[PDB]
Amino acid sequence: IIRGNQLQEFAAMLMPHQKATTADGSSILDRAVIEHNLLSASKLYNNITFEELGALLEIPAAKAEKIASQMITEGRMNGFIDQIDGIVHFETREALPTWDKQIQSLCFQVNNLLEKISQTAPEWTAQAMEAQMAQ
Amino acid sequence: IIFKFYESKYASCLKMLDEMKDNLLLDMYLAPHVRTLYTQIRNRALIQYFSPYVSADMHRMAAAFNTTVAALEDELTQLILEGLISARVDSHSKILYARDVDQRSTTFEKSLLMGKEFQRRAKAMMLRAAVLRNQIHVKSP
Amino acid sequence: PEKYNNPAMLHNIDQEMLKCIELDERLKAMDQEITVNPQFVQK
Amino acid sequence: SVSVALHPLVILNISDHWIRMRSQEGRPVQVIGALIGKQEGRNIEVMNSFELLSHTVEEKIIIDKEYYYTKEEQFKQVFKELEFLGWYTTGGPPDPSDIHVHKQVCEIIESPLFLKLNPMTKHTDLPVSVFESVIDIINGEATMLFAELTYTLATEEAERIGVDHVARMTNSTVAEHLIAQHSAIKMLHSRVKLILEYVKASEAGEVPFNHEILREAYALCHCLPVLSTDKFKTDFYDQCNDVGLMAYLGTITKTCNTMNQFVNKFNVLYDRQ
Amino acid sequence: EGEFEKAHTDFFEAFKNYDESGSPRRTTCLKYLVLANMLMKSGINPFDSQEAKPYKNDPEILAMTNLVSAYQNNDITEFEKILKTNHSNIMDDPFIREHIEELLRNIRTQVLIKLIKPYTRIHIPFISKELNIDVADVESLLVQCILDNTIHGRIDQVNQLLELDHQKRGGARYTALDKWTNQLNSLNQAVVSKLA
Amino acid sequence: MLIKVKTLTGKEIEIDIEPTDKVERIKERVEEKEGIPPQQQRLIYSGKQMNDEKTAADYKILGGSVLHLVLALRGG
Amino acid sequence: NLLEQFILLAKGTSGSALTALISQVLEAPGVYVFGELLELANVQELAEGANAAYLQLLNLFAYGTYPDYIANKESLPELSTAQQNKLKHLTIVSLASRMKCIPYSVLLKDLEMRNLRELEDLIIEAVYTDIIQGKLDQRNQLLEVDFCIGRDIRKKDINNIVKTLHEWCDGCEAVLLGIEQQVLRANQYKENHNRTQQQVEAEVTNIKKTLKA
Amino acid sequence: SIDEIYKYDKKQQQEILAAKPWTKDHHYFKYCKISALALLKMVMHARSGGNLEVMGLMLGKVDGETMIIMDSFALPVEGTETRVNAQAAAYEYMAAYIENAKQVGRLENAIGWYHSHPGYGCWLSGIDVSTQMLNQQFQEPFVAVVIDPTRTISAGKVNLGAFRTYPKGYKPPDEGPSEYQTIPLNKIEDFGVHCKQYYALEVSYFKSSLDRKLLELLWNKYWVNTLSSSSLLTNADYTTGQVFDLSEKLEQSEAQLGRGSEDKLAKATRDSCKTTIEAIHGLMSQVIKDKLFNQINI
Numbered sequence A: 001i002i003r004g005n006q007l008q009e010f011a012a013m014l015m016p017h018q019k020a021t022t023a024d025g026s027s028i029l030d031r032a033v034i035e036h037n038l039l040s041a042s043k044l045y046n047n048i049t050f051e052e053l054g055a056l057l058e059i060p061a062a063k064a065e066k067i068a069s070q071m072i073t074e075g076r077m078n079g080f081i082d083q084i085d086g087i088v089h090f091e092t093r094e095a096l097p098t099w100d101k102q103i104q105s106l107c108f109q110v111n112n113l114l115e116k117i118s119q120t121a122p123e124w125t126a127q128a129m130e131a132q133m134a135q
Numbered sequence B: 001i002i003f004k005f006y007e008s009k010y011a012s013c014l015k016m017l018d019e020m021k022d023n024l025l026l027d028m029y030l031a032p033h034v035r036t037l038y039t040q041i042r043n044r045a046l047i048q049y050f051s052p053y054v055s056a057d058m059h060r061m062a063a064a065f066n067t068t069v070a071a072l073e074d075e076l077t078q079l080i081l082e083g084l085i086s087a088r089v090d091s092h093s094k095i096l097y098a099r100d101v102d103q104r105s106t107t108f109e110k111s112l113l114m115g116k117e118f119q120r121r122a123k124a125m126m127l128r129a130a131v132l133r134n135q136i137h138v139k140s141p
Numbered sequence C: 001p002e003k004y005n006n007p008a009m010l011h012n013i014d015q016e017m018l019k020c021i022e023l024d025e026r027l028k029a030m031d032q033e034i035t036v037n038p039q040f041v042q043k
Numbered sequence D: 001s002v003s004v005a006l007h008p009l010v011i012l013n014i015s016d017h018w019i020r021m022r023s024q025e026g027r028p029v030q031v032i033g034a035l036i037g038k039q040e041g042r043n044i045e046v047m048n049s050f051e052l053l054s055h056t057v058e059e060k061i062i063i064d065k066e067y068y069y070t071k072e073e074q075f076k077q078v079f080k081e082l083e084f085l086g087w088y089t090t091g092g093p094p095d096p097s098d099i100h101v102h103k104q105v106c107e108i109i110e111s112p113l114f115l116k117l118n119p120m121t122k123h124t125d126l127p128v129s130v131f132e133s134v135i136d137i138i139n140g141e142a143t144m145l146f147a148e149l150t151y152t153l154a155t156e157e158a159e160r161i162g163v164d165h166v167a168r169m170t171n172s173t174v175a176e177h178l179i180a181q182h183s184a185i186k187m188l189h190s191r192v193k194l195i196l197e198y199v200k201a202s203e204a205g206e207v208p209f210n211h212e213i214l215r216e217a218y219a220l221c222h223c224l225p226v227l228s229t230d231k232f233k234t235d236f237y238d239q240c241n242d243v244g245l246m247a248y249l250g251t252i253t254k255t256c257n258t259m260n261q262f263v264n265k266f267n268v269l270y271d272r273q
Numbered sequence E: 001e002g003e004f005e006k007a008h009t010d011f012f013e014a015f016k017n018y019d020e021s022g023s024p025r026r027t028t029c030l031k032y033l034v035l036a037n038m039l040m041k042s043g044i045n046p047f048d049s050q051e052a053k054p055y056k057n058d059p060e061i062l063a064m065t066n067l068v069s070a071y072q073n074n075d076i077t078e079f080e081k082i083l084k085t086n087h088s089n090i091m092d093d094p095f096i097r098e099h100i101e102e103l104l105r106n107i108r109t110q111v112l113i114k115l116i117k118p119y120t121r122i123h124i125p126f127i128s129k130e131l132n133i134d135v136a137d138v139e140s141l142l143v144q145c146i147l148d149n150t151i152h153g154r155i156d157q158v159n160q161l162l163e164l165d166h167q168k169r170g171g172a173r174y175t176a177l178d179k180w181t182n183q184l185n186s187l188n189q190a191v192v193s194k195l196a
Numbered sequence F: 001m002l003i004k005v006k007t008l009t010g011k012e013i014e015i016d017i018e019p020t021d022k023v024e025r026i027k028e029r030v031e032e033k034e035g036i037p038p039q040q041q042r043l044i045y046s047g048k049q050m051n052d053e054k055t056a057a058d059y060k061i062l063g064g065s066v067l068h069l070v071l072a073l074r075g076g
Numbered sequence G: 001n002l003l004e005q006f007i008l009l010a011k012g013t014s015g016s017a018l019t020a021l022i023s024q025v026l027e028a029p030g031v032y033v034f035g036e037l038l039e040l041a042n043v044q045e046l047a048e049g050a051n052a053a054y055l056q057l058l059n060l061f062a063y064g065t066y067p068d069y070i071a072n073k074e075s076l077p078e079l080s081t082a083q084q085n086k087l088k089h090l091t092i093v094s095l096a097s098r099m100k101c102i103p104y105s106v107l108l109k110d111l112e113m114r115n116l117r118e119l120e121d122l123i124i125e126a127v128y129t130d131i132i133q134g135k136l137d138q139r140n141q142l143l144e145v146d147f148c149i150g151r152d153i154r155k156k157d158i159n160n161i162v163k164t165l166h167e168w169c170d171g172c173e174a175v176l177l178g179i180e181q182q183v184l185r186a187n188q189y190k191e192n193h194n195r196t197q198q199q200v201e202a203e204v205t206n207i208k209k210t211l212k213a
Numbered sequence H: 001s002i003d004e005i006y007k008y009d010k011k012q013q014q015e016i017l018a019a020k021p022w023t024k025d026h027h028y029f030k031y032c033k034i035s036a037l038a039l040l041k042m043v044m045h046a047r048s049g050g051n052l053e054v055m056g057l058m059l060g061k062v063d064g065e066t067m068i069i070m071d072s073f074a075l076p077v078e079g080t081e082t083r084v085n086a087q088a089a090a091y092e093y094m095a096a097y098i099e100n101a102k103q104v105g106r107l108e109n110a111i112g113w114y115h116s117h118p119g120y121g122c123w124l125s126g127i128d129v130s131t132q133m134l135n136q137q138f139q140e141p142f143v144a145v146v147i148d149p150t151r152t153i154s155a156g157k158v159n160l161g162a163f164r165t166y167p168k169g170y171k172p173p174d175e176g177p178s179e180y181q182t183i184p185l186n187k188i189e190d191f192g193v194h195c196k197q198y199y200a201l202e203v204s205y206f207k208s209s210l211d212r213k214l215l216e217l218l219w220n221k222y223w224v225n226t227l228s229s230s231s232l233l234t235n236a237d238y239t240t241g242q243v244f245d246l247s248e249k250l251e252q253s254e255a256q257l258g259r260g261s262e263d264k265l266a267k268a269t270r271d272s273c274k275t276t277i278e279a280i281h282g283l284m285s286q287v288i289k290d291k292l293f294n295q296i297n298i
């Protein structure tokens, strides 16, 4: 997420010519940064209200809702907007596939720990592996 | 009549149908079928009114169908019991709520009922086989 | 009343399956007696 | 730094290529091939891999770009959604010949990968290594070198079944299923027991005290139980009850069949025609 | 009267005849041509004829062209502003007045369909604000669209909103289980009734 | 002139043809030599399926070439 | 690894130099586990003297929490914003180690944040440091953690490690025994059924043979 | 050595081809050996085809009484079970691919063709039988391979069958084992009609020394996917289709019972048993996973 202060610093560093702004407003760089902020917040929230999204993007809640709806319609990002509660919902992450992913992560952790153990005490781990079959 | 039925002007359509009924009753080949045709048309209108709604207000429905709320409630009960309307009435706030049935619970219930019936029938026919093998029957004396 | 996501419902279905299994086992046991019947060898 | 997912089909292709070339030429010789896959954001995945035609002049290796382009058209005819990713070779650590061939390949794509397989190895881990090109300035001179990447084996049901069948190559049914699960659980047990031993040996005092390994062991121990939430429990019980109902219906069908056979035999026996 | 498709085909054939033969009448025929173009909304090439552009760029007659551009763009505000602002050209002709209603309704329907896509439960006053019509008009349009199976959703009258069905469950499994149960019931009854 | 003809399986047929012969003529020559009817037959040259009628020399006889032959099943 | 460099450059320093180095390493971004620095004999010997406050601060940063710092604010030396942020990140990690679905209320109480925006910004920073991987749920007021790093350990903690690993090994062994027993039972049942069917068929054949003669 | 089979003998192959002994006999080819890479490529292509059908070509050789397969390459056809071969696109593709592979080191020649029958068994239909008959009539040898990428996932074992047909007018003398295969109702007539015109070879798989070493090294990291499989979710549409087919077969069996090939109730029972056993296996795998991971409360 690119913050407003960093955006302002970049704008100050930028040359005047490169600041291509549309006549109605919404300068190209600012629009790209807002869309990037929304797409990056899609990777961080299960669901976010309009007020908090507006606080995150430093834009009014109505503009946040309009931009999110446009992005969802155009297919750039996945989700759906519940207007009565004013909440944008991103991906679901179903429970059983989440269980599968976490089991895979646990087994990967076990494998990495075993590799680190065998890379630090090679003689000890060789002796332990040799005695593993016997015992 | 047909255009207003198509574009959901039910009050006007029904009013003009009732106006035309008196002249229609004096026909030759349509006099016996007037009552059945009018009942079918009114039921079709009632079913089509509730089609787009998930929670309808019964006051507006009663106003649009030229009937009181009590008469509309009775007609809705008759329709929900058998016909195409799948809904539940709420007579506190006078609101008709669409009812969505979950498939999982219904299939579980029906499958368990079928299993119970199957087991009962199997036991009964096992007893029938036993009595048939043993040759038990009622004689004249 | 209920949704079918409980160990109690699992146990109920298990009991029903056990009863059906016993029924089928008895059916097969009384079928084999007819099968090995000498009278049920001519026809 | 991009996450790389490998596929055992690529490794099998490379190994078969090397074995075939060795058997054909009588003596071992290194082979050069190309990879194919999909890139999604920063996630690179390899799926298949074909072979490239190369020539040697003096001491330098040159890849036939015409043959590469014909093969590219051929593979785009079949795998429409797949694209070029990099090249693969058999050998040891990277060499200046490898750097030269990578420079040649870099004229085709922006940042091609580089896969290296070692047929003659003595280690315990897989000899497959993945590198990417990084250009640096050393002592005021521009040189492009290699940076190693960490890869994970990708998951696929058909691939898993095929690989397990090929690896195993071997009177019930529950038997087989449970035997497979047993093999995997056995591997897990071995690994967890060796870790517990190290930890117990470190605690009592037999090996030098290592802090990173002990912290990672604590983190591993803090990961259990996995997904003890109410939504997961509800989903699990949903699945269990669904399978239970299917088993109930299957039992009913089998009982109906047995009933029909018994009724037929009873009718044949106890009826006078 | 304008009896739907038959009258439409009669109109195209008559307009083609008056284009081939009535060359000097194009000054008033172009309005009817573009109107027919927006009624069919299939050709969407009224500007294909390069000869018509020099005569169209004259500012006396441009309401038809800006209407076509607004209609293709599918925006209601520009259409309404041009319609009410332009005077003595559009609203005085009965042959345009009788067909402006469907013309204005088509863009509203398309804009509503495009708007409804991302939301799951959306207020009716919001739609009324977007489409520049009263709440009752929005409700009537939603009812007509839902009955026509162009909008997949249902209206909540008490809370004045509409909820669109976006969730899909696996009902095929339960339908298959129902079929299996019914077949098992019938088969069991027949097998039992065999013995007698 | 004479041009070994090779199929996908690996069989090669030593066949005698004239430079002035057309593709249909080569097809019936193969029919007489092996037995394949001249409709379940596709000859491909240099990765190219010949449009029958188009004579042959044009294409490029160049003596001992190897026209690739693949079978077909007409309709059934 | 900044900790390795700090350990390497801490050999000759002592006293004021040691305390300045401790403050620098605590404020240094990236380093989140301080076990070897605490293991240093010099640092452990810093206890005797008037600078035990810095040793207590290092112990708090190794195994400690923001409520602990608040309870012991007076004794410990003052900390800057970077150190407070690091302590808050370590508090989040400590909570996620024992709880995998952390409510917002406990996080707010522990970190003494006022509005939800500050807490969510802090959690986003912690996620971006690659020390905790998870997602934020606003509707249910939850933070779901998929992964969290292992913090520093004591000498007496390893008993819990060995106990948990022993329990896991016992569970795996029990599962293997159950699988073996189930396979044996299934095979025995199949062979028994086949034998019974063969015996019945043989009896039927014998009866037919003796009847047909 | 084990890699000896990987050595291609051009002279021996030419001698065997020119001294064809399969003409005197009819059931000459009885063993079919497949390399590991060829089998894996076939399975992955059939799986990636999805629900539709895919077909490719197979390159190998012959050693006396057995038929060896070393490689397999797909050909496009746009798939989608087109009417038959190709708008000549595949016709050019086969020759182009073989020529391109010739100049690299793939010096073996074609030996058969493979295709997928996703969800309805492994057999040769009428058009498949005609195709194999035509191919064997002119270019010999040739073997058909049929894969079932869906039943492979469902049952946990590969469903691969290698077949070879009989000459026109030849009546094979009995010797029909005819093991039971579940086949849907809409595809049962073709299987019944065209069943004695082909026979199934005995299929075995082989691999090289480096392949064996690499697989035994790879298992040490691949053991995770076995414990994180969850086969009950990836195959649900297949189970629904199986239940639908079984219900239709049960209806037909009840109709036969009411009326006055043989005992369709037994076939329906076997189908139901297969489906239910697969489902229970999928459930007990998850039960084992839960016991292993969710109960070891720290």
Ligand SMILES: CC(C)n1nc(C(F)F)cc1C(=O)Nc1ccc([C@H]2[C@@H](O)CCCc3cncn32)c(-c2ccccc2)c1
Binding pocket: F071, F072, F073, H053, H054, H055, H077, H079, H080, H081, H082, H083, H084, H085, H086, H113, H115, H116, H125, H127, H128, H131, H134, H135
């Ligand atoms: C070896 C190949 C190239 N071949 N050679 C000759 C012969 F003329 F030489 C002829 C052929 C050849 O493509 N046959 C063929 C025939 C039928 C089908 C389809 C067809 O029925 C359509 C329904 C699906 C199906 C189920 N079972 C066979 N099919 C296919 C085929 C199979 C999978 C993907 C694409 C096509 C290929």
Ligand SMILES: [Zn+2]
Binding pocket: H115, H116, H117, H123, H124, H125, H128
């Ligand atoms: Zn087929």
